[PDB]
Each structure stands twice: as C-alpha cells, then as structure tokens.
Amino acid sequence: AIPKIASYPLPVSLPTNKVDWRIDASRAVLLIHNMQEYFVHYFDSQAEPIPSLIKHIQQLKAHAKQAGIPVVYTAQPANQDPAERALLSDFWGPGLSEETAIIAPLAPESGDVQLTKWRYSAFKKSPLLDWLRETGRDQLIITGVYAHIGILSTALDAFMFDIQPFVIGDGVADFSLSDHEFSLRYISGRTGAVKSTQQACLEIA
Amino acid sequence: AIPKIASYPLPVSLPTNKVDWRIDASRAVLLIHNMQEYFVHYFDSQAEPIPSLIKHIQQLKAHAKQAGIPVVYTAQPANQDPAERALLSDFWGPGLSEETAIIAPLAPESGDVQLTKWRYSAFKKSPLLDWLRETGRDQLIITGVYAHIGILSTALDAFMFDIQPFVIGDGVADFSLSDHEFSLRYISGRTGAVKSTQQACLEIA
Ligand SMILES: C=C(O[C@H]1C=CC=C(C(=O)O)[C@@H]1O)C(=O)O
Ligand SMILES: C=C(O[C@H]1C=CC=C(C(=O)O)[C@@H]1O)C(=O)O
C-alpha cells in the first residue's frame, strides 16, 4: 500500500549533476505529476513537506506561464478497468475510486493539458511523446509525487526518448525523506538533472 | 563512469515479494542482459560475484532450454552514432568501441535471439515487445548486469507493458552489494518478483 506518510522536511541540499544541462524556455514543458487529492491525502497536507512543495510548484507554474513554457498535468482516472490497470493491481490493489481532482492550489487552467495516467511513466498509454516531438519540445521539468515511483519512471522514459529530464528536488515529495533523497541521487547519477526550484526559476528566466 | 567494481558476494537472502507470481514455462522468456565482455570486464571475472553469477545464468539457460523457454540476449553495438546514442553520452561518454561479444561461458546458440541494445530498457528501439506479444509470452525472466540500471529499467518497462518481470537475485550483479540489494528491494516492492536461481529452476520444472 501507499503508507500514511509521516511528516518530513523537503531537502534543501541536492546531489551534484553529471550533466551541465540548463532549462531553456523555448525547449521545455513543465509536468505536474499526480498532484491529485487521492495521492496528496496520504500526507498530512498541513505538515512538511506539503506546504513548501505546493508553494514551489505554484511558483514554477507561474514562472513557466510567464516564460511561455507549456504546463501538463497527469492524473489517474477512478475505477480503472482491471484489464487496463493490469499488473498494478497486484502491487497496489484496485486503485482510486474518488479524490481524482488535482489539488486546488495547483488547479489546471484552460490552456494546461491534462493527461490520463495509466502507468508509472507518464509516457505509457498517452500522447505525451508524440506531443513533445510534434512541438519540438525536448526538455521535461518534472514536479509532483512520488519521487521514487512515477517521477523516476517518467524521467527514465523521457531520458530514453531523448528528452532531457529536470527533476525539481524541492518540487517533488515521496514516502519518506530517505526515499526522496535516494531518488534524487539516482536521477542525478543516471537519468536526468536535479535542480532546485530557485535554480530552475533562474534558468527559465 | 562505470567504476572498477570491487569484489563482493552475491546475495543469498532476497526480499519478500508483494506478488505471488510463479514462472510458467509456457509463458516465459529468459533474458540474458548485457553479458558482454565490455561490461563484465569492469569486474575481476575471477572474483565474486562473477563465477557464481555465470554458473547461475548457465544453469538457468540450460533449464530454460529443457523446458522450452526461449532465450534472448541483449548487447550494445560498438561505436554508436552520437545521434543514436543521444543523452547516454552525457552520462557515460561515447560508449564501447570493442569487447562487444557475449562472454564465452554464456555463448548464444543458434536459436537464441540476439537483440541490439540502445537504451537502459531492452524494449526501447527493439522488437522485444512485438515479439513477446506475437508469441503470447507474458513473463520475462531477467538476468545479467547491472541490477540498478538496465535490469531495473527493463523490468519497469516489462511491468508497464503487462509482462510479469522475474528478476533473479543471484542471477544479476551490480556496481556494489549495496546497489545490488537496493535494486532487488525496489523491484520486489514496485515492479516485479525477485526469485533465487534455485527457486526459478523449481518453478520452471
Ligand atoms: C503517484 C503515483 O502513483 C503510483 C504510486 C502508488 C500507487 C499507484 C496506483 O495505485 O496506481 C500508482 O501506480 C506515482 O506514479 O508515483
Ligand atoms: C550494462 C548496462 O549498460 C548501461 C550501464 C552503464 C553504461 C552504459 C553505456 O555506456 O551505454 C549503459 O547504458 C545496463 O544497461 O545496465
């Protein structure tokens, strides 16, 4: 199951990157990954890391808009058909039946694309890759939950599809600080660049 | 870079699985992943974990053959075009130029398929998924190196493509015992079943 997640502080220190990539507003898309009521409610939303996570994603979204970076959301649909949900059910059960809305502080606006999420990777069973390729966007800024699961899997697919992933270290959260930090170390070492919210904002500008 | 890998003992204790899946010879394919001279030579092949790794993979291959389970190998090609190698070069450099052969103790036979490996996941830029689907094989037994990189990424893709991954805990190796054990814990918790060589052999029979 997803645990009841004990409060923990968002990390400030981030791993060093092996790559020198920088976010370019002409190349990038901002993904807000699985910030649904369902997933967020495994935390106490009034306790760390959630207030600061939300603030950081809000800020990045506002800066993205100002810079002309498209924003895309992922969200799982309720009551997934067992044949379509497939092997996920063997790990997580039948899945959400409610609480599908994106949390209000991160409400999608009319021009923000909302993709249906079927697997850990946002690319699977979705038009994400075709859209990025059609529009010539080859950087994906990744925020949301959970760092070691769909954030990581989406970054791996992006990387393998020749899209530079930028995972925002204080713009994701996870089941624990340990899982969160290990995820960032894995990403920096193997499959993307990790940036702070402040650094990503500076690069976007 | 891939480190010069210090000797370490293959783990015997394996994590518990969340799933109750069992290998079925009518459903399964055995993947021997990146057991090329190039990758193996980052270890001392005469020191643990390599002699036991090789023995275990040899045994599984022989049992697979006896049980009618197809065997498939992956191998990276030498001197990859930078445009095709893409973002990998930013993490690992230009990649191998030599040492492309599968190590002799695991020599492919005439009926064993050899796929060209382009990304961490064996599915990317390959016919693997189409072949599995065409032939109705929906279990993938995974052996080889490195546990936390291509073994993990291949398992993630298989899982997301509705193929049950069985990662052989004492049939893979990695940059360190810690990386190896963490990989197995991740897999058992999130994206496949971990089996010992002995257990996989019993299930195959
Ligand atoms: C927020 C995520 O959803 C996954 C994690 C746990 C449970 C899940 C489920 O019930 O389907 C999702 O697959 C993520 O991909 O990180
Ligand atoms: C044995 C693997 O190759 C990868 C790991 C390190 C260096 C690699 C390279 O130079 O391309 C591979 O991407 C694996 O996928 O686990």
Coordinates of C-alpha atoms and ligand atoms in Angstrom, one line a residue:
Chain A
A1 CA 0.0 0.0 0.0
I2 CA 0.9 3.7 -0.1
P3 CA 1.8 4.3 3.6
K4 CA 0.4 7.0 5.8
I5 CA 3.4 9.3 5.2
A6 CA 5.0 10.8 8.3
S7 CA 5.9 14.5 8.0
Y8 CA 9.4 15.3 6.9
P9 CA 11.3 18.4 5.6
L10 CA 11.9 18.9 1.9
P11 CA 15.5 18.6 1.2
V12 CA 17.5 21.7 0.5
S13 CA 20.8 20.1 -0.4
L14 CA 20.7 18.3 -3.7
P15 CA 23.1 15.9 -5.4
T16 CA 25.6 17.2 -7.9
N17 CA 24.7 16.6 -11.6
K18 CA 26.8 14.7 -14.1
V19 CA 25.3 16.8 -16.9
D20 CA 25.6 20.6 -17.5
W21 CA 22.1 21.0 -19.0
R22 CA 20.1 24.1 -18.3
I23 CA 16.4 24.7 -18.7
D24 CA 15.6 26.7 -21.9
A25 CA 12.1 28.2 -22.0
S26 CA 12.0 27.6 -25.8
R27 CA 12.6 23.8 -25.3
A28 CA 10.8 22.9 -22.0
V29 CA 7.5 21.7 -20.8
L30 CA 6.5 21.6 -17.1
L31 CA 4.9 18.4 -15.9
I32 CA 2.9 18.4 -12.6
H33 CA 2.7 14.7 -11.9
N34 CA -0.1 13.1 -10.0
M35 CA -0.9 16.0 -7.7
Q36 CA -4.4 14.6 -7.1
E37 CA -6.3 14.7 -3.8
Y38 CA -6.0 10.9 -3.7
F39 CA -2.2 10.9 -3.6
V40 CA -1.7 14.0 -1.6
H41 CA -4.0 12.8 1.2
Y42 CA -1.5 10.0 2.2
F43 CA 0.3 13.0 3.7
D44 CA -1.0 15.5 6.3
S45 CA -1.2 18.4 3.8
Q46 CA -0.8 20.9 6.6
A47 CA 2.6 19.4 7.6
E48 CA 6.0 19.4 5.9
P49 CA 6.8 18.7 3.1
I50 CA 3.4 19.6 1.6
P51 CA 3.1 23.4 2.2
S52 CA 6.5 24.1 0.7
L53 CA 6.0 21.5 -2.1
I54 CA 2.8 23.3 -3.1
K55 CA 4.4 26.7 -2.9
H56 CA 7.3 25.7 -5.0
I57 CA 5.2 24.1 -7.7
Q58 CA 2.9 27.1 -7.7
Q59 CA 5.9 29.4 -8.2
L60 CA 7.3 27.2 -11.0
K61 CA 3.9 27.1 -12.8
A62 CA 3.6 30.9 -12.6
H63 CA 7.2 31.4 -13.9
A64 CA 6.6 28.8 -16.6
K65 CA 3.5 30.6 -17.8
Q66 CA 5.4 34.0 -17.9
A67 CA 8.2 32.4 -19.9
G68 CA 5.9 30.6 -22.4
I69 CA 6.6 27.0 -21.1
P70 CA 3.5 24.8 -21.6
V71 CA 2.2 23.1 -18.5
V72 CA 0.9 19.5 -18.4
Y73 CA -0.8 17.5 -15.6
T74 CA -1.1 13.8 -15.1
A75 CA -4.0 12.2 -13.2
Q76 CA -5.2 8.7 -12.7
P77 CA -8.9 8.0 -13.5
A78 CA -11.2 6.5 -11.0
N79 CA -12.3 2.9 -11.1
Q80 CA -9.9 1.6 -13.6
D81 CA -11.0 -1.5 -15.5
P82 CA -8.9 -4.4 -14.2
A83 CA -7.8 -5.4 -17.7
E84 CA -6.4 -1.9 -18.3
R85 CA -4.9 -1.5 -14.8
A86 CA -3.3 -4.9 -15.3
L87 CA -0.3 -5.8 -13.1
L88 CA -0.5 -2.6 -11.0
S89 CA -3.4 -4.2 -9.1
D90 CA -1.0 -6.9 -7.9
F91 CA 1.1 -4.2 -6.2
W92 CA -1.4 -1.6 -5.1
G93 CA -4.9 -3.1 -5.2
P94 CA -7.8 -1.9 -7.4
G95 CA -6.8 1.8 -7.1
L96 CA -8.6 5.0 -6.5
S97 CA -12.3 5.3 -6.7
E98 CA -12.6 9.0 -5.8
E99 CA -10.4 12.0 -4.9
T100 CA -9.4 12.3 -8.6
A101 CA -9.3 16.1 -8.8
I102 CA -6.0 18.0 -8.9
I103 CA -5.5 19.7 -5.6
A104 CA -7.0 23.2 -5.7
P105 CA -3.8 25.2 -5.0
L106 CA -2.4 23.7 -8.3
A107 CA -5.7 24.0 -10.3
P108 CA -5.2 23.5 -14.0
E109 CA -6.1 26.5 -16.2
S110 CA -7.8 26.3 -19.5
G111 CA -4.6 26.1 -21.6
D112 CA -3.0 23.5 -19.4
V113 CA -3.1 20.0 -20.8
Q114 CA -4.5 17.2 -18.6
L115 CA -3.3 13.7 -19.5
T116 CA -4.8 10.5 -18.2
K117 CA -2.2 8.5 -16.2
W118 CA -2.2 4.7 -16.6
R119 CA 1.3 3.6 -15.5
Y120 CA 4.3 4.9 -13.5
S121 CA 5.6 6.6 -16.6
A122 CA 3.5 9.4 -18.0
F123 CA 4.5 8.4 -21.5
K124 CA 2.8 5.0 -21.4
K125 CA -0.6 4.8 -23.0
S126 CA -0.6 8.6 -23.5
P127 CA 0.1 11.1 -26.3
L128 CA 2.9 12.8 -24.3
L129 CA 5.8 11.7 -26.6
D130 CA 4.0 12.5 -29.8
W131 CA 3.1 15.9 -28.5
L132 CA 6.6 16.8 -27.3
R133 CA 8.0 15.6 -30.7
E134 CA 5.4 17.4 -32.8
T135 CA 6.0 20.7 -31.0
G136 CA 9.8 20.4 -30.8
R137 CA 10.0 20.5 -27.0
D138 CA 12.8 18.2 -25.8
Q139 CA 13.1 19.2 -22.1
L140 CA 10.7 18.0 -19.4
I141 CA 10.7 19.7 -16.0
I142 CA 9.2 17.2 -13.5
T143 CA 7.4 18.0 -10.3
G144 CA 4.9 16.1 -8.1
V145 CA 4.7 12.8 -6.3
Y146 CA 6.0 10.2 -5.7
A147 CA 9.7 10.7 -6.3
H148 CA 10.8 7.1 -6.4
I149 CA 7.8 5.8 -8.4
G150 CA 6.2 7.8 -11.2
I151 CA 8.6 10.7 -11.1
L152 CA 11.5 8.3 -11.5
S153 CA 9.8 6.2 -14.2
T154 CA 8.7 9.2 -16.2
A155 CA 12.3 10.6 -16.0
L156 CA 13.7 7.3 -17.2
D157 CA 11.3 7.1 -20.2
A158 CA 11.9 10.8 -21.1
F159 CA 15.7 10.3 -21.0
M160 CA 15.4 7.1 -23.2
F161 CA 13.2 9.1 -25.6
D162 CA 15.9 11.8 -26.0
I163 CA 14.1 14.3 -23.8
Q164 CA 16.2 15.9 -21.1
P165 CA 14.5 15.4 -17.7
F166 CA 14.9 18.1 -15.0
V167 CA 13.6 16.8 -11.7
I168 CA 12.9 19.6 -9.2
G169 CA 14.4 18.3 -5.9
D170 CA 12.3 20.5 -3.6
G171 CA 9.4 20.2 -6.1
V172 CA 8.7 16.6 -5.5
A173 CA 7.8 14.5 -2.5
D174 CA 7.9 10.9 -1.5
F175 CA 7.0 8.2 1.1
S176 CA 10.0 9.4 3.3
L177 CA 13.0 11.7 3.2
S178 CA 15.2 8.7 2.6
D179 CA 13.2 7.6 -0.5
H180 CA 13.1 11.2 -1.7
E181 CA 16.9 11.7 -1.4
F182 CA 17.8 8.3 -2.9
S183 CA 15.5 9.1 -5.8
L184 CA 17.3 12.4 -6.5
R185 CA 20.7 10.7 -6.2
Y186 CA 19.6 8.0 -8.7
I187 CA 18.3 10.7 -11.1
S188 CA 21.4 12.9 -11.0
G189 CA 23.6 9.9 -11.4
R190 CA 21.7 8.0 -14.1
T191 CA 18.8 9.6 -15.9
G192 CA 18.4 13.4 -15.6
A193 CA 19.4 16.7 -13.9
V194 CA 18.2 17.6 -10.5
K195 CA 17.5 21.4 -9.9
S196 CA 16.2 23.3 -7.0
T197 CA 13.1 25.4 -7.6
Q198 CA 15.2 28.6 -7.2
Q199 CA 17.7 27.4 -9.8
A200 CA 15.0 26.3 -12.3
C201 CA 13.4 29.6 -11.9
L202 CA 16.6 31.4 -12.7
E203 CA 17.2 29.2 -15.8
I204 CA 13.7 29.7 -17.0
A205 CA 14.3 33.5 -16.8
Chain B
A1 CA 31.8 6.2 -15.5
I2 CA 31.3 2.6 -14.7
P3 CA 33.5 2.0 -11.7
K4 CA 36.2 -0.6 -11.3
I5 CA 33.9 -2.9 -9.3
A6 CA 35.4 -4.3 -6.1
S7 CA 34.6 -7.9 -5.4
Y8 CA 31.6 -8.7 -3.4
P9 CA 29.5 -11.8 -2.6
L10 CA 26.2 -12.5 -4.4
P11 CA 23.4 -12.1 -2.0
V12 CA 21.7 -15.2 -0.8
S13 CA 18.9 -13.6 1.1
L14 CA 16.3 -11.9 -1.1
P15 CA 13.5 -9.5 -0.3
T16 CA 9.9 -10.8 0.1
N17 CA 7.7 -10.3 -2.9
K18 CA 4.3 -8.5 -2.8
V19 CA 3.1 -10.7 -5.7
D20 CA 2.5 -14.5 -5.7
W21 CA 3.5 -15.0 -9.4
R22 CA 5.3 -18.1 -10.4
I23 CA 7.3 -18.7 -13.6
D24 CA 5.4 -20.8 -16.1
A25 CA 7.5 -22.4 -18.9
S26 CA 4.6 -21.9 -21.3
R27 CA 4.5 -18.1 -20.7
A28 CA 8.2 -17.1 -20.0
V29 CA 11.2 -15.9 -21.9
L30 CA 14.7 -15.8 -20.4
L31 CA 16.6 -12.5 -21.0
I32 CA 20.4 -12.5 -20.5
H33 CA 21.0 -8.8 -20.3
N34 CA 24.3 -7.1 -21.4
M35 CA 26.6 -10.0 -20.5
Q36 CA 29.2 -8.6 -22.9
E37 CA 33.0 -8.7 -22.4
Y38 CA 32.9 -4.9 -22.1
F39 CA 30.5 -4.8 -19.1
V40 CA 31.9 -7.8 -17.4
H41 CA 35.4 -6.5 -17.5
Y42 CA 34.6 -3.8 -15.0
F43 CA 34.8 -6.7 -12.5
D44 CA 37.6 -9.1 -11.9
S45 CA 35.8 -12.0 -13.5
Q46 CA 37.8 -14.5 -11.4
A47 CA 36.4 -12.9 -8.2
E48 CA 33.0 -12.9 -6.6
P49 CA 30.3 -12.3 -7.7
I50 CA 31.2 -13.2 -11.2
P51 CA 32.0 -17.0 -11.0
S52 CA 28.7 -17.7 -9.2
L53 CA 26.8 -15.3 -11.4
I54 CA 28.0 -17.1 -14.5
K55 CA 27.2 -20.5 -13.0
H56 CA 23.7 -19.5 -12.1
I57 CA 22.9 -18.0 -15.5
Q58 CA 24.4 -21.1 -17.2
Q59 CA 22.2 -23.3 -15.1
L60 CA 19.0 -21.2 -15.8
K61 CA 19.8 -21.2 -19.5
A62 CA 20.2 -25.0 -19.6
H63 CA 16.9 -25.4 -17.6
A64 CA 15.1 -22.9 -19.8
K65 CA 16.2 -24.9 -22.9
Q66 CA 15.0 -28.1 -21.4
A67 CA 11.6 -26.6 -20.5
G68 CA 11.0 -24.9 -23.9
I69 CA 11.6 -21.3 -22.7
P70 CA 13.1 -19.1 -25.4
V71 CA 16.3 -17.3 -24.6
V72 CA 17.1 -13.8 -25.7
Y73 CA 20.3 -11.8 -25.3
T74 CA 20.9 -8.0 -25.4
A75 CA 24.2 -6.4 -26.5
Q76 CA 25.2 -2.9 -27.2
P77 CA 26.9 -2.3 -30.6
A78 CA 30.3 -0.7 -30.9
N79 CA 30.9 2.9 -31.9
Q80 CA 27.3 4.1 -31.6
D81 CA 26.5 7.1 -33.7
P82 CA 26.2 10.1 -31.4
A83 CA 22.8 11.0 -32.7
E84 CA 21.5 7.5 -31.9
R85 CA 23.3 7.2 -28.6
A86 CA 21.9 10.6 -27.7
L87 CA 21.7 11.6 -24.0
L88 CA 23.5 8.5 -22.8
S89 CA 26.8 10.1 -23.9
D90 CA 26.2 12.9 -21.4
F91 CA 26.3 10.3 -18.6
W92 CA 28.7 7.6 -19.8
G93 CA 30.8 9.1 -22.7
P94 CA 30.9 7.8 -26.2
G95 CA 30.5 4.2 -25.2
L96 CA 32.1 0.9 -26.1
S97 CA 34.3 0.5 -29.2
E98 CA 35.3 -3.1 -28.7
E99 CA 34.6 -6.1 -26.3
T100 CA 31.1 -6.5 -27.8
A101 CA 31.0 -10.3 -27.7
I102 CA 28.8 -12.1 -25.2
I103 CA 31.2 -13.7 -22.7
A104 CA 32.1 -17.2 -23.8
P105 CA 30.6 -19.1 -20.8
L106 CA 27.2 -17.7 -21.9
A107 CA 27.7 -18.1 -25.6
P108 CA 24.4 -17.7 -27.6
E109 CA 23.3 -20.8 -29.5
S110 CA 21.8 -20.7 -33.0
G111 CA 18.2 -20.5 -31.8
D112 CA 18.9 -17.8 -29.2
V113 CA 17.8 -14.4 -30.3
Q114 CA 20.3 -11.5 -30.0
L115 CA 18.8 -8.0 -29.7
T116 CA 20.7 -4.8 -30.2
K117 CA 20.6 -2.7 -27.0
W118 CA 20.3 1.0 -27.4
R119 CA 18.9 2.2 -24.0
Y120 CA 18.7 1.0 -20.4
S121 CA 15.4 -0.7 -21.2
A122 CA 15.7 -3.7 -23.6
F123 CA 12.3 -2.7 -25.0
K124 CA 13.5 0.7 -26.4
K125 CA 14.3 0.8 -30.1
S126 CA 13.9 -3.0 -30.3
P127 CA 11.4 -5.7 -31.4
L128 CA 11.2 -7.2 -28.0
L129 CA 7.6 -6.2 -27.1
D130 CA 6.2 -7.1 -30.5
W131 CA 7.9 -10.5 -30.3
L132 CA 6.6 -11.2 -26.9
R133 CA 3.1 -10.2 -27.8
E134 CA 3.0 -12.0 -31.1
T135 CA 4.1 -15.2 -29.4
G136 CA 1.9 -14.9 -26.4
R137 CA 4.8 -14.9 -23.9
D138 CA 4.0 -12.6 -20.9
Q139 CA 6.7 -13.4 -18.4
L140 CA 10.3 -12.2 -18.6
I141 CA 13.0 -13.8 -16.5
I142 CA 15.8 -11.2 -16.2
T143 CA 19.5 -12.0 -15.6
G144 CA 22.7 -10.1 -16.2
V145 CA 24.2 -6.7 -15.4
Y146 CA 23.8 -4.0 -14.0
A147 CA 21.0 -4.5 -11.5
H148 CA 20.2 -0.9 -10.8
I149 CA 20.5 0.3 -14.4
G150 CA 19.3 -1.8 -17.4
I151 CA 18.0 -4.7 -15.3
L152 CA 15.7 -2.3 -13.4
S153 CA 14.7 -0.2 -16.4
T154 CA 13.9 -3.3 -18.4
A155 CA 11.8 -4.7 -15.5
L156 CA 9.9 -1.3 -15.3
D157 CA 9.1 -1.3 -19.0
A158 CA 8.1 -5.0 -18.9
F159 CA 5.8 -4.4 -16.0
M160 CA 4.2 -1.4 -17.6
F161 CA 3.7 -3.4 -20.8
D162 CA 1.8 -6.1 -18.8
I163 CA 4.7 -8.6 -18.8
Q164 CA 5.5 -10.1 -15.4
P165 CA 9.2 -9.5 -14.7
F166 CA 11.1 -12.1 -12.6
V167 CA 14.5 -10.7 -11.6
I168 CA 16.9 -13.4 -10.5
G169 CA 18.5 -12.1 -7.3
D170 CA 21.6 -14.2 -7.5
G171 CA 21.5 -14.0 -11.3
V172 CA 22.3 -10.4 -11.6
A173 CA 25.3 -8.3 -10.5
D174 CA 25.9 -4.6 -9.9
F175 CA 28.4 -1.9 -9.1
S176 CA 28.3 -2.9 -5.4
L177 CA 26.5 -5.2 -3.0
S178 CA 24.5 -2.1 -1.7
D179 CA 23.4 -1.2 -5.2
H180 CA 22.5 -4.8 -5.9
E181 CA 20.4 -5.3 -2.8
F182 CA 18.7 -1.9 -3.1
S183 CA 17.7 -2.9 -6.7
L184 CA 16.2 -6.1 -5.6
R185 CA 14.2 -4.3 -2.8
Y186 CA 12.9 -1.8 -5.3
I187 CA 11.9 -4.5 -7.7
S188 CA 10.1 -6.7 -5.2
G189 CA 8.3 -3.6 -3.8
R190 CA 7.4 -1.9 -7.0
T191 CA 7.9 -3.6 -10.4
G192 CA 8.4 -7.4 -10.4
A193 CA 9.1 -10.6 -8.5
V194 CA 12.6 -11.4 -7.3
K195 CA 13.5 -15.2 -7.3
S196 CA 16.6 -17.1 -6.5
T197 CA 18.2 -19.2 -9.2
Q198 CA 17.1 -22.3 -7.3
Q199 CA 13.5 -21.2 -6.9
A200 CA 13.3 -20.2 -10.6
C201 CA 14.6 -23.6 -11.6
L202 CA 12.0 -25.3 -9.4
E203 CA 9.2 -23.2 -10.9
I204 CA 10.4 -23.8 -14.5
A205 CA 10.2 -27.5 -13.8
Ligands
LIG1 C1 1.7 8.9 -7.5 C2 2.0 7.7 -8.2 O1 1.1 6.7 -8.4 C3 1.6 5.3 -8.3 C4 2.2 5.1 -6.9 C5 1.4 4.3 -6.0 C6 0.1 3.7 -6.3 C7 -0.4 3.8 -7.6 C8 -1.6 3.2 -8.0 O2 -2.5 2.8 -7.1 O3 -1.8 3.0 -9.2 C9 0.4 4.4 -8.7 O4 0.8 3.5 -9.7 C10 3.3 7.6 -8.9 O5 3.3 7.1 -10.1 O6 4.3 8.0 -8.3
LIG2 C1 25.0 -2.9 -18.6 C2 24.3 -1.6 -18.8 O1 24.7 -0.7 -19.6 C3 24.5 0.7 -19.2 C4 25.2 1.0 -17.9 C5 26.4 1.8 -18.0 C6 26.9 2.3 -19.2 C7 26.2 2.2 -20.4 C8 26.7 2.8 -21.6 O2 27.8 3.2 -21.8 O3 25.8 2.9 -22.6 C9 24.8 1.6 -20.5 O4 23.8 2.5 -20.7 C10 22.9 -1.5 -18.2 O5 22.0 -1.1 -19.0 O6 22.8 -1.9 -17.1

